[PDB]
Design a protein around this motif. Structure first.
Motif, PDB file in Angstrom:
ATOM      1  N   UNK A   1      28.872   6.897  13.073  1.00 30.93           N
ATOM      2  CA  UNK A   1      29.266   7.183  14.444  1.00 30.93           C
ATOM      3  C   UNK A   1      30.599   6.495  14.691  1.00 30.93           C
ATOM      4  N   UNK A   2      31.654   7.264  14.897  1.00 31.09           N
ATOM      5  CA  UNK A   2      32.934   6.602  15.090  1.00 31.09           C
ATOM      6  C   UNK A   2      33.017   6.108  16.526  1.00 31.09           C
ATOM      7  N   UNK A   3      32.027   5.330  16.947  1.00 30.41           N
ATOM      8  CA  UNK A   3      31.893   4.917  18.332  1.00 30.41           C
ATOM      9  C   UNK A   3      31.704   3.412  18.399  1.00 30.41           C
ATOM     10  N   UNK A   4      32.403   2.789  19.339  1.00 33.71           N
ATOM     11  CA  UNK A   4      32.273   1.372  19.633  1.00 33.71           C
ATOM     12  C   UNK A   4      31.645   1.119  20.989  1.00 33.71           C
ATOM     13  N   UNK A   5      31.715   2.107  21.871  1.00 30.73           N
ATOM     14  CA  UNK A   5      31.252   2.058  23.252  1.00 30.73           C
ATOM     15  C   UNK A   5      29.764   2.357  23.271  1.00 30.73           C
ATOM     16  N   UNK A   6      28.953   1.326  23.476  1.00 26.46           N
ATOM     17  CA  UNK A   6      27.509   1.455  23.382  1.00 26.46           C
ATOM     18  C   UNK A   6      26.956   2.297  24.522  1.00 26.46           C
ATOM     19  N   UNK A   7      25.745   2.793  24.327  1.00 24.54           N
ATOM     20  CA  UNK A   7      25.035   3.540  25.350  1.00 24.54           C
ATOM     21  C   UNK A   7      24.080   2.613  26.082  1.00 24.54           C
ATOM     22  N   UNK A   8      23.984   2.785  27.392  1.00 24.78           N
ATOM     23  CA  UNK A   8      23.259   1.854  28.243  1.00 24.78           C
ATOM     24  C   UNK A   8      22.290   2.625  29.131  1.00 24.78           C
ATOM     25  N   UNK A   9      21.086   2.097  29.315  1.00 24.04           N
ATOM     26  CA  UNK A   9      20.111   2.787  30.146  1.00 24.04           C
ATOM     27  C   UNK A   9      19.172   1.780  30.787  1.00 24.04           C
ATOM     28  N   UNK A  10      18.313   2.277  31.674  1.00 27.92           N
ATOM     29  CA  UNK A  10      17.227   1.502  32.269  1.00 27.92           C
ATOM     30  C   UNK A  10      15.909   1.932  31.645  1.00 27.92           C
ATOM     31  N   UNK A  11      15.105   0.970  31.226  1.00 23.50           N
ATOM     32  CA  UNK A  11      13.810   1.256  30.626  1.00 23.50           C
ATOM     33  C   UNK A  11      12.744   0.522  31.416  1.00 23.50           C
ATOM     34  N   UNK A  12      11.752   1.262  31.891  1.00 22.60           N
ATOM     35  CA  UNK A  12      10.756   0.695  32.781  1.00 22.60           C
ATOM     36  C   UNK A  12       9.758  -0.147  32.008  1.00 22.60           C
ATOM     37  N   UNK A  13       9.355  -1.265  32.601  1.00 23.77           N
ATOM     38  CA  UNK A  13       8.296  -2.103  32.056  1.00 23.77           C
ATOM     39  C   UNK A  13       6.984  -1.691  32.698  1.00 23.77           C
ATOM     40  N   UNK A  14       6.039  -1.262  31.883  1.00 27.71           N
ATOM     41  CA  UNK A  14       4.717  -0.928  32.369  1.00 27.71           C
ATOM     42  C   UNK A  14       3.737  -2.036  32.002  1.00 27.71           C
ATOM     43  N   UNK A  15       2.646  -2.105  32.745  1.00 29.06           N
ATOM     44  CA  UNK A  15       1.646  -3.116  32.502  1.00 29.06           C
ATOM     45  C   UNK A  15       1.978  -4.438  33.170  1.00 29.06           C
ATOM     46  N   UNK A  16       0.950  -5.273  33.304  1.00 28.66           N
ATOM     47  CA  UNK A  16       1.092  -6.567  33.944  1.00 28.66           C
ATOM     48  C   UNK A  16       1.477  -6.464  35.405  1.00 28.66           C
ATOM     49  N   UNK A  17       1.445  -7.583  36.118  1.00 31.53           N
ATOM     50  CA  UNK A  17       1.864  -7.591  37.508  1.00 31.53           C
ATOM     51  C   UNK A  17       3.378  -7.558  37.590  1.00 31.53           C
TER      52      UNK A  17
ATOM     53  N   UNK B   1      19.554  10.308  21.428  1.00 38.36           N
ATOM     54  CA  UNK B   1      18.340  10.936  21.919  1.00 38.36           C
ATOM     55  C   UNK B   1      17.534   9.884  22.647  1.00 38.36           C
ATOM     56  N   UNK B   2      16.780  10.324  23.633  1.00 35.84           N
ATOM     57  CA  UNK B   2      15.933   9.437  24.408  1.00 35.84           C
ATOM     58  C   UNK B   2      14.493   9.653  23.964  1.00 35.84           C
ATOM     59  N   UNK B   3      13.914   8.648  23.335  1.00 33.43           N
ATOM     60  CA  UNK B   3      12.499   8.674  23.011  1.00 33.43           C
ATOM     61  C   UNK B   3      11.733   8.080  24.181  1.00 33.43           C
ATOM     62  N   UNK B   4      10.747   8.808  24.676  1.00 35.97           N
ATOM     63  CA  UNK B   4       9.961   8.361  25.815  1.00 35.97           C
ATOM     64  C   UNK B   4       8.485   8.443  25.486  1.00 35.97           C
ATOM     65  N   UNK B   5       7.732   7.438  25.919  1.00 33.41           N
ATOM     66  CA  UNK B   5       6.281   7.469  25.790  1.00 33.41           C
ATOM     67  C   UNK B   5       5.700   8.660  26.535  1.00 33.41           C
TER      68      UNK B   5
ATOM     69  N   UNK C   1       2.795   6.656  34.079  1.00 31.64           N
ATOM     70  CA  UNK C   1       2.136   5.982  35.187  1.00 31.64           C
ATOM     71  C   UNK C   1       1.628   4.615  34.735  1.00 31.64           C
ATOM     72  N   UNK C   2       1.832   3.611  35.581  1.00 29.93           N
ATOM     73  CA  UNK C   2       1.606   2.219  35.211  1.00 29.93           C
ATOM     74  C   UNK C   2       0.123   1.853  35.235  1.00 29.93           C
TER      75      UNK C   2
END
Ligand SMILES: [Mg+2]
Ligand SMILES: [Mg+2]
Ligand SMILES: [Mg+2]
Ligand SMILES: [Mg+2]
Ligand SMILES: [Mg+2]
Ligand SMILES: [Mg+2]
Ligand SMILES: [Mg+2]
Ligand SMILES: [Mg+2]
Ligand SMILES: [Mg+2]
Ligand SMILES: [Mg+2]
Ligand SMILES: [Mg+2]
Ligand SMILES: [Mg+2]
Ligand SMILES: [Mg+2]
Ligand SMILES: [Mg+2]
Ligand SMILES: [Mg+2]
Ligand SMILES: [Mg+2]
Ligand SMILES: [Mg+2]
Ligand SMILES: [Mg+2]
Ligand SMILES: [Mg+2]
Ligand SMILES: [Mg+2]
Ligand SMILES: [Mg+2]
Ligand SMILES: [Mg+2]
Ligand SMILES: [Mg+2]
Ligand SMILES: [Mg+2]
Ligand SMILES: [Mg+2]
Ligand SMILES: [Mg+2]
Ligand SMILES: [Mg+2]
Ligand SMILES: [Mg+2]
Ligand SMILES: [Mg+2]
Ligand SMILES: [Mg+2]
Ligand SMILES: [Mg+2]
Ligand SMILES: [Mg+2]
Ligand SMILES: [Mg+2]
Lengths: 384, 61, 129
Positions: free
Chosen positions: A173-189, A339-343, A33-34
């Motif tokens: 990691x025999x991988x070239x194809x990166x992983x992509x996600x959305x990460x929320x910005x908390x704080x500030x206006x 793995x997804x590390x989340x606050x 929660x922001x």
RNA sequence: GGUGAACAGCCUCUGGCCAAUGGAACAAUGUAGGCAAGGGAAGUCGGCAAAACGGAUCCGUAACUUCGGGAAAAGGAUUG
RNA sequence: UUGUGGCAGCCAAGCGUUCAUAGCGACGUUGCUUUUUGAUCCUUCGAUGUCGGCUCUUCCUAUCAUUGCGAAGCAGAAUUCACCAAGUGUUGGAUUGUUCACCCACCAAUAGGGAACGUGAGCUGGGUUUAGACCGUCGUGAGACAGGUUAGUUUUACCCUACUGAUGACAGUGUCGCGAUAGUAAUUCAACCUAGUACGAGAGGAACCGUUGAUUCACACAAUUGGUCAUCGCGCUUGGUUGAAAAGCCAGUGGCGCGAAGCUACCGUGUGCCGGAUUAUGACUGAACGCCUCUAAGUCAGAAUCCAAGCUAGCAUGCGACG
């Protein structure tokens, strides 16, 4: 016809259906929660479970038997090279829910993140964003991109950054194809959030700017897959007597005569593993940044110069060369899994959460066989 | 650091590892791993096993 | 209090008697503190108070239920510095409900998890390890 | 033929065969066969099933008995 | 249907050292229930597998413990009656085929029931319930026994559905998202401090906060320990076999010792969650009724509760933003 003797139900009805996850990357199903008075920070990363080892530390916990004593604890290492922010997404509150209003991408996207948009990169023409790129070279195009930023600042209730991993820096990691996600910005206006995200396009985020030492984090990911499993291992029900006709490893009665149906509560055979899971309050014991003493495995009590990687490398992973993160306990997934590390969503107030960690020893002996040296030169000088 | 020794094979035992046996005469035997432990309980003599620390000093290897 | 250890001794396990009381052999019939679970046998570990009978020994001690404390177990258990420590045999001593030893001496080593939890056994102990 | 008390089991020579639809993979549940820390029948109507014992040489062997037995009782030591 | 079985009311002669109603409640009387049995013979005799246990799930409340309360012949500790409440839990054994029973032991407690007296193409087959056989009583006899005993075959799923998982078409193809709805999970105890304090003549003897642990469950994971071997990895060895040595092979895995890796164990390790609305109940304001009054109108505090959040799914033949 009541049951003669009672015992709690096997298995949890709260993790149904126990099917294969629809996702390989773990999904952040809720952000903290922001708090608008906080400065603009990020709330998550994408790491790679490298392996496990154990520490020995000394405790401070007045009243516990472990006070002023040592303890041995398993830890997991997650390799977390810097994230690269390529985009920004805005959200607006509607009567049905949250909705994406618009989004702006960076001008330059690496081959790795552009691989994410193809199912056969090599035989394609690699045209993805080749025309959106030209919006950055004409004043009418620059006008749009700038105008889109104004719209986010004007209406957004939530702002997220698009970030990809630098998958190429983990050769194991025999991988070239990166992983992509959305990460929320908390704080500030929202005006603060849009400035924070766009200002920092095409650049790298270390793990330090988000996570700290001794803080509690949730880890999200998909568990190890075990194929099709019967009821004894999948659900944990007891085995039947040895002398049963047609097999031991089953549930004897799957329901009463009425209702004349099998209920969703009864244990059945099926998929085991490869499930989505969120796992809370995994504590952070050590942050390892490439280029400082905190990267290697040398404590204030043990000064033997050695790297975090055990001898022979992390099994089925390789060598940790970049930034990494040391969590207390075990981690969802096999080795190499993203793995997804989340606050944390909760308030951390308990004495465990605030506890300060001081390592005394990190085991870097080999995880094949019964490892007996801490470094290769220790081994080489022992023998000859 | 505060290492410790295997009573059978005479190797260094690092913190957080090892197997500690207590015998009826209250003598403590600390083993490095399970290979040592099973040879000990099979009543082998670490002076007759070529890879042991006792053997190597006994033959000046 | 104490930390949780690998339980070695279910009910019907028959243990040696490490005190000078005349009992040779204790027979666990239950474990204090066990809130059960269908089909699971109550089990004991070092420092756990149990109810037992004497199946070999003096006439005046047999055919009676009495409290005992486990002092030695063969089942390995993880000390909280990482080692897995175990004994050569299983042993316990006869006590009262308040923990007072019926006998006066203990023959052999004593688990440290027991000595710190029963001070009267700690007093009679030879070497606490 | 060898091992061995042995037409036991196990391997070999003469003679005879490889005739039992093939390919891929190695989930659940089976069926047949194993092993399992600590405990040792608490399981179960019930030790069902399994495990333990097992050859030979030396020593030693109780109750009871129709005096013939019980007896390979039981209990020990040895073995390349 | 409800005599009988079980639960519950009303009146109040008496008990309760004095006191009908704290707790009871005679003589009388009104009900409810459908886990008993009886009564009946409506369904089924071109067959609905007939005791019990084991296994697993769900449901009820007539609440045993656990949460929050009200009363007492409630000083404290313990105990009893009642309310809201079915969220969570209700065990290990000796004897018996037993349901039932009864002891041993632990426990916070060892409550009570339903689901075709749940559950045999789920098991088992101890009992009962064919054919063999023994005893006792009966019978002239063949034979009988709601007497005891011993041995006696437990068949089929590949169909539909249900359930559990697995693909999948329907605005080109892809990436990132939203979230209607459905599921849901955490649980109880102990030690220290309070404390030999409150209370009490003494005997006895609490609790809240705080701290540290543990039980039942759930979800993961394998650094360490343990288990697993046909790594047929290394070593040793019986018998045979290749003239011998070396190297092997066969005895379906010849056998033994150690055995990485992977898998895996309360036998190993880690983690398990914050708001709101209220119930019982205690209150505020305040009339009806000059006073009073938690109630009429209006307010409050409030729980193992409910709804959220969080967690799992999300083909919702739903939708958004971009390439
Ligand atoms: Mg039943
Ligand atoms: Mg019940
Ligand atoms: Mg598990
Ligand atoms: Mg059968
Ligand atoms: Mg390993
Ligand atoms: Mg049972
Ligand atoms: Mg011969
Ligand atoms: Mg022969
Ligand atoms: Mg075993
Ligand atoms: Mg038995
Ligand atoms: Mg029994
Ligand atoms: Mg039983
Ligand atoms: Mg019986
Ligand atoms: Mg048998
Ligand atoms: Mg005899
Ligand atoms: Mg009636
Ligand atoms: Mg009646
Ligand atoms: Mg009729
Ligand atoms: Mg009829
Ligand atoms: Mg009929
Ligand atoms: Mg039929
Ligand atoms: Mg019919
Ligand atoms: Mg039928
Ligand atoms: Mg009620
Ligand atoms: Mg049926
Ligand atoms: Mg029968
Ligand atoms: Mg008959
Ligand atoms: Mg008869
Ligand atoms: Mg079938
Ligand atoms: Mg819901
Ligand atoms: Mg091992
Ligand atoms: Mg292993
Ligand atoms: Mg007032």
């Amino acid at each position: 016809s009541h049951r003669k003797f009672e015992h709690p139900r096997h298995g949890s009805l709260g993790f149904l259906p126990r099917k294969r996850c629809s996702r390989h990357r773990g999904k952040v199903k809720s952000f903290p929660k922001d708090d608008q008075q906080k400065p603009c920070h990020l709330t998550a990363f994408l790491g790679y479970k490298a392996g496990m080892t154990h520490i020995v530390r000394e405790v401070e916990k007045p009243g516990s038997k472990l006070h002023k004593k040592e303890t041995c604890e398993a830890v997991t290492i997650i390799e977390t090279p810097p994230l690269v922010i390529v985009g920004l997404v805005a959200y607006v509150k509607t009567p049905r829910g949250l909705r994406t209003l618009n989004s702006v991408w960076a001008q330059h996207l690496s081959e790795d993140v552009r691989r994410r948009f193809y199912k056969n990169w090599c035989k394609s023409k690699k045209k993805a964003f080749t025309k959106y790129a030209l919006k950055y070279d004409s004043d009418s195009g620059k006008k749009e991109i700038q105008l889109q930023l104004e719209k986010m600042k004007k209406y957004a209730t939530i702002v997220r950054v698009i970030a990809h991993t630098q998958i190429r820096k983990m050769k194991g990691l025999k991988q070239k194809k990166a992983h992509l996600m959305e990460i929320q910005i908390n704080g500030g206006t929202i005006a603060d959030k849009v400035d924070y995200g766009y200002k920092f396009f095409e650049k790298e985020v270390p793990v330090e700017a988000v996570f700290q030492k001794d803080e509690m984090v949730d880890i999200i990911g998909v568990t190890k897959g075990k194929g099709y499993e019967g009821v004894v291992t999948r659900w944990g029900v007891t085995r039947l007597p040895r002398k049963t006709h047609r097999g031991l490893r089953k549930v004897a009665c799957i329901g009463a005569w009425h209702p004349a149906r099998v209920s969703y509560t009864v244990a059945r055979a099926g998929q085991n593993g490869y499930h989505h899971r969120t796992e809370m309050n995994k504590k952070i014991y050590k942050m390892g940044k490439s280029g400082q003493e905190s990267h290697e495995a040398c404590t204030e009590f043990d000064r033997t110069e050695k790297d975090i990687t055990p001898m022979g490398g992390f099994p089925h992973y390789g060598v940790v060369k970049g930034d990494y993160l040391m969590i207390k306990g075990c981690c969802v997934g096999p080795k190499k899994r993203v793995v997804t590390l989340r606050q944390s969503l909760l308030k951390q107030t308990s004495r465990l959460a605030l506890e300060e960690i001081k390592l005394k020893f990190i085991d870097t002996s080999s995880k094949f066989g019964h490892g007996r040296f801490q470094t290769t030169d220790e081994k080489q000088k022992f023998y000859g | 650091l505060k290492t410790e020794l295997c009573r059978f094979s005479g190797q260094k035992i690092y913190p957080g590892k090892g197997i500690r046996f207590i015998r009826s005469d209250s003598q403590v035997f600390l083993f490095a791993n399970s290979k040592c432990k099973r040879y000990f309980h099979n009543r082998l003599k670490p002076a007759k096993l070529c890879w042991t620390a006792m053997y190597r000093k006994q033959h000046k290897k | 209090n104490k930390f949780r250890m690998s339980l070695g001794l279910p009910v019907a396990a028959t243990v040696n008697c490490a005190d000078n009381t005349g009992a040779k052999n204790l027979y666990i019939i239950s474990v204090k503190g066990i809130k059960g679970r269908l089909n699971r046998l109550p089990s004991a570990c070092v420092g756990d108070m149990v109810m037992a009978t004497v199946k070999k020994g003096k006439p005046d001690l047999r055919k009676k239920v009495m409290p005992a404390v486990i002092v030695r177990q063969r089942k390995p258990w993880r000390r909280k510095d990482g080692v897995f420590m175990y004994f050569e045999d299983n042993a316990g001593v006869i006590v009262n409900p308040k923990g007072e030893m019926k006998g006066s001496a203990i023959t052999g080593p004593i688990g440290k998890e027991c000595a710190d939890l029963w001070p009267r056994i700690a007093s009679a102990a030879n070497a606490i390890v």
